[PDB]
Amino acid sequence: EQCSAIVPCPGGRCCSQWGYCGNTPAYCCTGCQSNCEETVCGDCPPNSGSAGDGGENGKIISRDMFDELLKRRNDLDCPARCFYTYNDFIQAAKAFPAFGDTGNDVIRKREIAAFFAQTSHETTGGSPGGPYQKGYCFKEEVGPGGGYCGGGYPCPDPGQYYGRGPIQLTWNYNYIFCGDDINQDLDNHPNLNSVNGVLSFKSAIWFWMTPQSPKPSCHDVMTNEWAPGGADGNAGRDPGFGLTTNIINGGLECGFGTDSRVQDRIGYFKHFCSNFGIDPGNNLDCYTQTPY
């Protein structure tokens, strides 16, 4: 839309020198008239290098491999440009030592590909049908709408539990449980997941690693540590990438045939599997799985 210093953007974006609303350096930096500097202006900071060669997990996903998977995330039209770094990812992963470090190298690669595929989908700046190089374009839900509070739990900030970070962590209960396990008060300070890159990655790896009955963890599914428990066989829940989509968002995406969101998750996964030189494995969709 149009805007000026005296008419800010209704939805809160930067008002450019020429009076249009947006979230890129052209709107937000030089000459910006209102609600400025909401994205980084200029070159990203140089790498901290605090992860070095990445350690144990860096044997599966090097610095270069991380930046090849997430090739276009620092395009000028990604609002999260410069936020997501290899050094923060490796520091976060060190807090969940089994992640990407369980099983033979084919399983470790496929776990990491699946994790980056699901988080790339949650934060996608790409177009339906691909290609699949612009994961991790965003770090906050674009139009935060409904209160995201399950009434069972404390809710000091009813409008503030919208999606943040690589898995777009949402709902008061997930901020409670995640914050508890990573020693952060995310219930009272939920913006930590969009202002601190290490905490942001920790929240996504936390979700990936944590069973929440009846759901197994995405980790145990992808590393061949889950077996269908009874109700599961006749709900159609078979081990593979599709079951991680069911765990993440199956109530809205699974059990009713071809769906564009599911296809986008699978598209990122196949692309990342090709980069890693591995096969995606079996049961890639959840089209005939009952949701949890």
Ligand X SMILES: *[C@@H]1O[C@H](CO)[C@@H](O[C@@H]2O[C@H](CO)[C@@H](O)[C@H](O)[C@H]2NC(C)=O)[C@H](O)[C@H]1NC(C)=O
| Subset of 130-159 contacting Mg ion (CB under 5 A) | 138-140
286, with CB counted inside 10 A (0-12, 13-18, 19+), is: buried
Q: Give min distance, CB of 103 to ligand X, in A.
A: 26
Taking CB under 5 A as the binding criterion, the range among 49-57, 79-87, 128-136, 140-148 that sits at the site for Cl ion is 79-87
Catalytic residue among 38, 122, 141, 225: 122
Nearest to 135 by CA among 119, 157, 151, 150: 119
For the chain, give the residues followed by a break (C–N over 2.5 Å). Answer: none
| Subset of 154-173 contacting Mg ion (CB under 5 A) | 163, 168
58 binds Mg ion, rule: CB under 5 A: no
Position 143: which residue type?
G
What is the DSSP annotation of 193-243? Answer: HHH-HHHHHHHHHHHHH--BTTBPPHHHHHTT-----SHHHHTT--SSHHH
Q: Which residue from 250, 267, 269, 272 is in contact with Cl ion, where contact means CB under 5 A? A: 250
Q: Give min distance, CB of 269 to Cl ion, in A.
A: 14
Q: Is 225 a catalytic residue?
A: no
Provide the pairing of β-strand 14-15 with 21-22: antiparallel
85 binds Cl ion, rule: CB under 5 A: yes
Pseudo-torsion of CA 40, 145, 148, 201, nearest 10°?
A: -20
196 binds ligand X, rule: CB under 6 A: yes
Taking CB under 5 A as the binding criterion, the range among 1-9, 64-72, 75-83, 148-156 that sits at the site for Mg ion is 75-83
CB 102 within 8 A of CB 223: yes
Q: Which does 163 bind (CB under 5 to 8 A by kind): ligand X, Cl ion, Mg ion, none?
A: Mg ion
CA–CA gap between residue 1 and residue 22 (Å, rounded): 9
| Subset of 47-86 contacting ligand X (CB under 6 A) | none
198 binds ligand X, rule: CB under 6 A: yes
Q: Please, which residue, 117 or 199, has the CB nearer to ligand X?
A: 199
Q: Quick check: helix, strand or coil at residue 22?
A: strand
199 binds ligand X, rule: CB under 6 A: yes
Q: Please, which residue, 195 or 231, has the CB nearer to ligand X?
A: 195
- Sequence-distant (6+) residues with CB within 8 A of 17 are 30, 31, 32, 33
| Subset of 129-148 contacting ligand X (CB under 6 A) | none
Known catalytic residues are 122
Site for Mg ion, rule CB under 5 A = 79-80, 138-140, 163, 168
Site for ligand X, rule CB under 6 A = 196, 198-199
